[model samples]
Target: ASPFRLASAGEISEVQGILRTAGLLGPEKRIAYLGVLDPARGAGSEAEDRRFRVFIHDVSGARPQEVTVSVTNGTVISAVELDTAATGELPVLEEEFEVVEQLLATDERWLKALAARNLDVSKVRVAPLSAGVFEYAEERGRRILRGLAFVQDFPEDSAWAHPVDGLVAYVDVVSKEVTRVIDTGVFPVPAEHGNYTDPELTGPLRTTQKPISITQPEGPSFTVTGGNHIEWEKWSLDVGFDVREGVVLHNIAFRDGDRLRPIINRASIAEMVVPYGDPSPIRSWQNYFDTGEYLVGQYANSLELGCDCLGDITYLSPVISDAFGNPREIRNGICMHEEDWGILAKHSDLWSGINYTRRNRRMVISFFTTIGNYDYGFYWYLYLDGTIEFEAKATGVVFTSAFPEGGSDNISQLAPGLGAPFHQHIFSARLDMAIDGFTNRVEEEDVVRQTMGPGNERGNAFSRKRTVLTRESEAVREADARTGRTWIISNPESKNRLNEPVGYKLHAHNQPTLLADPGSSIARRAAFATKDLWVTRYADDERYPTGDFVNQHSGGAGLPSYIAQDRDIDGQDIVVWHTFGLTHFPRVEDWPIMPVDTVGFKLRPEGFFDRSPVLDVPAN
Candidate 1:
């Protein structure tokens, strides 16, 4: 069945209307629009068959209900009510912060509190807190919003400089009121002199050169069919968008001459956590799960011609839901292009006077998402040598806290009174491996030093230890640079000419495990970041590393909960969960905006192919 088709606008409208006819939508009832779920994994067999799930909440009622509406050919077939509540959807939207600000502006106490700090109510920026703060106001059953006061004429570059600290506001959307305000303490406002646009504040640095252009003289050699299907050389896949996962690649496979082999059934980011190190009450509970709390794909920035991407590019528009439960098209949410890699291979023979050099090319599928203060760029690259890479680039304003009496020795100072504390941006991806077929096995290869013996005169010898994991209980592993440890997803039934199992090797570069205490709240909530790799038996219901519902949830939901099953994984369909991130102890150079701090991992063909697949390409 074709899987490249996405839910259309008419289908979304039909589902909403069907829900309304069933008395699920009402003025007094709060209708939270959770995204549409793909029916291919459910009862439907074709791509056109789809359904949407929405959360229905009654203001006077105790709990919310979930309603699933089926749509086909712009018509609603059925609207069924599920047994559970829609706890997985985002409780609050980013746009709702504006409403919170307006509610706080009308309060006399709130105006007097900010006025004492020489701040205006209109200039205060409201940010939504994650699930951690949900329990603090659990009895109220309303969305809570945090307030950050900026300068009156806060420049875009210096908005993070001056912050009014230690303030929390609880807002009720239905009543449009600030129900509660908690003031821990107050800190002196920092001076606003850290404007990034004014280079004179730091130093004068300029580039003197013409704009170098990257051109594809013969045009791109890739084909984008069916709107979302992309085929470049031997690589073919269907790309789709998700509210939480950002970009999702389905049915990824590679062709070797006349034979096509399956690599992965589905691949996407599972979850991410950003935890701060400051122990103060205001900043201590600042851990955020970007994927769980906020919808990344819904906030994807549109790609422009020369700024976001270069060369011949093809842009794909993704359909997403708005705050009002309406479908809208996100223009240029996904960008695909072919790039010229420096070199693939080179050979020289002086005696024969023969030399050959070839330039490499790669296909990149990418998207960018901005969550609050930080922006992330995700890229999926398909190389000429049958190598695939998932990379993340982090660049944006640092989430800074006001440090009274100047900055401390422990934290790095981005400005006079702004402290950019140590933190970690941890990310994990769920890869459903379908090597050749569905059944696959995971093996860990570690290079260990060997003692001096008769065979080896020196003590500097090393040997590789291969351990095949047969059960889910033994699949959790960490990346060790000292041992040169690596993991492989091998198809034991498929062997190459050399009698080696055909598989793909996983290589992680510059990945840091979580530094937070394992027993801490942040660590428990983001358990997936504790290890570098996890292999589990495939289950369609197990998608997010932190479970389907992460917001306002305590521990015991994500990777930790999934591994408790401990089912057999030997020669069975398996899924690989890999984590990548950095333990960022912020430096002064990472002030107004950070340069791209990139981290990624690669999946390369081990013995899946007979030889170098790009050997036939013409040399320049």
Candidate 2:
């Protein structure tokens, strides 16, 4: 009875006690991550899968032992210490923030480094960052958090205002000491406070626009059951939440009269990376995996109506474990509602002189998570026409640095000395859509220009070339904006009225993948960012794009490792992993609080529908 649901507060407490009683957990050890274990697919169900996983980090720790304990049985199943080169280090726990700052504050080297810059060590804050993979001897085999220094003038003042340039602090989190401090050189810190929050600092406000409220007199059109299953128009999906990968929608189906045709089996943004572009020493190892490294869902913002969201909103407040494996509820973690989406279809019968049109309305499911200086909003939109869309919205203050001499191409000067480096936020979406059933295959369609041939003897010809990716080796692909490339996932068993295999198309926005050099550490660690699309045989363990452990990972783990088997994918149960990336060369306007920049892909019923879905919409 307990295994099928999200882990309860009682269960988490009991599980922690069980681990403590079993001598697996102690005061020195901290729970880095804890979540409900989703049983392995195709395996015997919850009897074995009814486990709550707790990753115990011996911060008193690189390889945190990933321990799974059965809350139902109240026993430990398996405990394993992860490999650094293969599996990677454990997640950087939030408690490590105190560990890092304490060391940086007291350490003589770090203090001297700060004092040399003529800065007060008392008010300075070191932004503890993920110490990327490197070859330094002292840092080797140590759990490290690379600290970037920022100065705070007042308690409410912006620490981002004064970025202490050239000095980097590398602290071994487990040892609880600063390993080394790299004071490259002294640079002038930006003078501006950059505090847009305080009314006194901003000086003026714009009051021209009047309030435009979104009101639904009839309330919400969607039907929600048990705060999990949702139904709006033809859409049906069960929402799921986790500490790592949050807001997973499962069994997304469309009701066609008596038939409930399932399209997607499960969908979630499995992982994403924000790799800083600057090659300068202080910022070169600036890549961060916002998903796996930081555990994206743990930082989910408690959204409010009228401010973060508008309309007749329904919120999904999920329970997740805190740093101590204690269950904590993030209220209004996921916002759900409907929005007027302009037009769905419009037509005119010219001969009959009758015009017909249907307005588009979509069910919106979204959540926002703030990672340090940046906030990212993940959204899922289900339309009346059985179409699904995913959007990742970026809005927050950009990471700033001191401007360099001779002017730089990678860094854009937001103000005088405030340099914001060019970077990319690449998101990987795990789409396990079944169309109508599980056995499905992927195919790519790209437009081709035809030469003077028999079919095009007139010398004007172009056609969309259909290529079925029959194997895993052939499935790795990039978007061809020049050729208008699109990937289609279809079920061979399911057929539409036209006798075509029912299918859905993945429309990827043509954006640059990882811009790092081919041989760089980030390229190897984030190989999934190298391609636009990757089709892999569906495996329960293959969820994370950067592998299970992303922190300080030593490459070739995720998509690259998963596809190495190169199994036959044609007409087989498969998963489609799409990499959606957004590039930013910072501008002056993007300073303070950046405007929301959106990028994502669309999943439309290519041949999954017999006819247009707009016919059912009644005229207003």
Candidate 3:
């Protein structure tokens, strides 16, 4: 009856075992994902809440299903099944990656392909990929991976810098064999080992930087209540980690005086896609849905993997499932801390020589995941100014291939022979907003300039425009830098002191939509990437932007399906699906290892607070 929380490991294991013993789960079935399924909205709703939304995949039978099971401490109350994977598969499993390495090692053809380049299975790394959907009959409905070879200096060396170009092995998982090997002679394998971190390569470490340290002299400004709930300053929220979506922020509210006022009911990054722009056969069909296809959260890296922590920090571990559907823990997978963000507000009055400064700080929650050649970091920040920001950073080495003689414009030349391709890292964030309450309206706000003929003698007339999105179809919008376009989710019933609805404005700037052709397979499958914004009535079952099942999907399932009915959206429990990210063309400096490139959106208070919320801070 209360707000839903993730099922415990004991509960998951118990329900799984129970389902299998009852013949509900097939012997060959594996759990794909699991999450809490909340109850329906509104007092008139009669539907009750459920415990778990379990996706079970049976690849041998080529079928998968989603189970809505009500289980509390291992006892089952009710269960419902749905054929959720009729047209698609689950995220890439660790089992799938395992199969690629074993298949390549045993297959003679793959060995020969490695031998042709004067390399063998021992020296090369097998990087399997989510073979995107295509018209090939050999791959249709088959769990196949396009495995590419990379030369590694050592067992743990980063292999991205040494791609064995012009070679691709298509391995079918069900057949447990390499379907075919395509080996075309292109540029020779790069000779550089690219291990910059190796002392043998770099010779010595730098000593120019001085030692500096940070700490909370007293203690951390934020507190994690009940192990998961985060409370800091005026911000309060619940943190949930999923095997698919990773960081989920729930019940994001601000403490205003006595009561907690709601801003976002629930928020999480739904899906993301990286569509390569190179037209070569090596990269022509390279659009990867990282979150949906690869299960980025399942591959999360521990915060201790790198020296990124500073000052006092709180590390939270998340429980995830292994390839065998058993519980596994990624310790320190999520990092929580606070960082100073310059000044919150400053004033210097010459009238009376008065001066004042109020320093601003933000609570940060972050996690990193390594997906093959790329590593991504997702950071959620709560600022003192009542602004919530989500940033997705790309820092791993860029996907590389052989150099081409200007065959395409998408290739960025790295060294003499190595070239990295252009790609767009687009992420869609789902915000279930309750500005002040559940019933809210979405509006598009833009600045427009009027002609001089329209009542103004001079041409310096610019006005603000508000377009209320009253229907689902009307809510599909894009960002415009020219007009400074923005979207706001406001509670019409909750008025501020200015007699306007309290709201949060989504600043979705620096966004570039999908560059793939409209009729392309990726465009169809990642339809959410084509637009910057979409609004839909809240539904508990609806989560992912690219649908619940995204691997090898034929398309038109997620965002497109959600808005087909074009239902009314005015003053309803509406969700904002913001698809925003950056288009990356690699630079030469990106070689060895790429630097962190960040792109994201922010939700700032739009009349949600009566005034600045950080004025009363007393510095220690």
Candidate 4:
């Protein structure tokens, strides 16, 4: 009954102090271990093959519940929980019951030759939950919060998992009884750091390395043009309490205009491990999910604070432009300046009375590429608001298949009536940043003098009334098929490849046929569902390296008032209407390290908060 065992780095630091005395490593976490390795034995040299590795902390903030023990047998196999409230996952029902009991014994002599319209099929009710079972639904949390107000919502299922959509009664963990249900899917959005093993095909990319030391350093000093190369070193933890105003407003909110832009940042800092497989059966059990009875009976005083104090500040700025239409330099350096204000003194509860609103301005950055395992990770967001916005809950469990089987047809299937196996659980980059600029101005010569040309103002200035339609300014375009020109997104992975032709061509490119088989060779084991295998083709500017040409926009217009609440205006809380129509796609076990979800957004004072508002200070 030997599963494994071989951890000696001081017994993996006493199994990370028994996972920080079992609170699962709390106490202002900032873990980092990254040293052991061995796990990969089975399938070949079989000796009942088994292997394991340990030593890892790097919890990667914002609700990152990471803990990966098993240095060989310290066992805890893997942890990674980070859920933002409302949890649901229970659907693995399979039916057939021997072909419905052989169609109920041929429906008793075909019930009068199927009486023309086929009724009375041997007393109906044919098993499989009577034709539809996949339980785990129970609603009633105040009538699902009054039918979720009016239902146009979708902040990853009601910001922080408050999702409810109809039926689900509740009262049965194992037959307590009282239900109603309907949860046929959902489960895979709770990670603390992953790769699985070896995976990484391309991750740490950053380039420029000349300007090393500059002084006066109160804040603002970025210019290095290339990104993605973090072995973790920008660290400074004190957790005491003065973060010099969030590193002086994160360096005036990222300054750099007049063009020249580059960003694809990726980060994953940790400081706790020891979790996975077996805690020797809870080492004489002391308190695991009781979290001390939900932290002293239902959050002791419930002002919502179970993050156990944390620290982080990540950025992945992309989408930049400038020739003075004034777009780049959102606020000098993108806001948490004053030399990173030492993370609000590492935060133990900032000032305890919990007045804690030093301002976060919500910024979420995600990029999860894994292509066969060319590793990629950048899930940044510093704070999240109020109950800490449920600590940024990430959800995505896609596994498409209703047609393009595993034989590989060219990977794209998942859209017929959007019905057949189309799993989609969205939410990413919630955005709420504002160093304040572009206060909604509109001139370009009065929008070209109100659509010009009545008297041909200056002898037919390229008239047709100088280009008709004085309206149509939904503004948000992009193009550059070698300069047919279109441009306008300001920034966020902004890139364009113009060709305008859009009338509809997307059900997997209108799939209908392509069955070729000239004697075996889809390119030996489908290269990610083969698109005619490329083998090797390159042309500079790092194609598909997590940079260049992404452009998302998540369906335009206000972006859902900025995804489900808390960007405090104290009153008109619209925060981009819950991020308009959310998108998110990153997969492959979220490579290298990226599973921290403490998202955020809130920058009130809109009436322009005129109490000397222009520089009211305070950002970190």
Off-target runs (Cα >4 Å) in candidate 3 are 1-7, 24-27, 39-50, 73-85, 405-408, 453-455
lDDT of 1 by residue, 1-620 (tens): 35446556776667667766776666655554456665444334434556676655555443556666676544444444422223333344656656767887887767777877768666666555553433453423444445545553553546677666666566665456677676677777667656767767658666676788888888789997877888897888888787678888887898888877889888888887898777766666777788876767778999897889988888988887664556778888888999988889988989989898989888999999998788999999989898989999999888777765645644567777777767889989899998887879999989878889888887777888889988778888888987888988989888878988799999987477888788887777788888999988878668788876565556667778778789777778899999989788788888767988988899999899888889778765
Prediction 4 TM-score vs. true: 0.23
Question: Which RMSD does model 3 reach against the true structure?
Answer: 2.6
Clashing pairs for predicted structure model 2, backbone only? 58-61
TM-score for all models, in order of appearance: 0.91, 0.96, 0.94, 0.23
Q: Could you give candidate 2's per-residue lDDT for residues 1-620 as a string of tens digits?
A: 42334556787887888888888877777888888766555555534546787888875544568888987788898898866545677887887766667788888888887788788888898787997786775665677899898889888887876888888888877777777888889889888888888787666788788998899999999988865788889788888787888788887899987789888888999997999998888889998898889888999999988999998899988888776667789999999999999988888998999899889999998999988899999999999888899999999989988988778988989887888889999999999868788889998999988899787899898888889999898889988899999999999988989999999988989899888889998999899998999999988778788988888877888899889989999998899999988999988888777999999999998988889866989998
Q: Residue 22 lDDT in model 2?
A: 85
Q: Would you list the C-alpha lDDT of every candidate in the order shown? A: 0.75, 0.85, 0.81, 0.22
Residues 1-620 of candidate 4: C-alpha lDDT, one tens digit per residue? 22222223354455555565555555444332122222232335444322222222222223434455543344566666533222111111111222332343343333332233233333222211111101113431111110010111222221111111111122221222223222222322221222223235345555766553323434232222223111111211111000000110111121122322211111111100010111121111111111100110111111111121112322322211111111122121111211232222223464565543343233322332221101222233322211012122332222221122242222232232111121111112212121222111111111122234666655534311111111112211111223222111122122223322111000011111112232212111111111200111112222111111111111111211121122222111111111101122323342223343332222222122122211323544
lDDT by residue (tens digit), candidate 3, 1-620 = 23445446765676677667656577687777766654455536554444666777676755566665665544444544444335676667777787787788878887777777778687777887888887677676677788877888788776877888888888877778788877767468776666768888778788899877777788997877766888899899988888888888888999987879989988899897899898767667788888998888888998873286677889888877654456788889998999989888888999979788888899999999988778999999999989999999899877887667665487887887787889999999999988888889999999988888758878888899999999998989988888999988899999988899998999987567998999998999999899999999888768888887888777898989999879889999889999988898888898878889989999999999888777788753
Model 3: colliding residue pairs: none
| RMSD each, Å | 3.1, 2.0, 2.6, 25.6
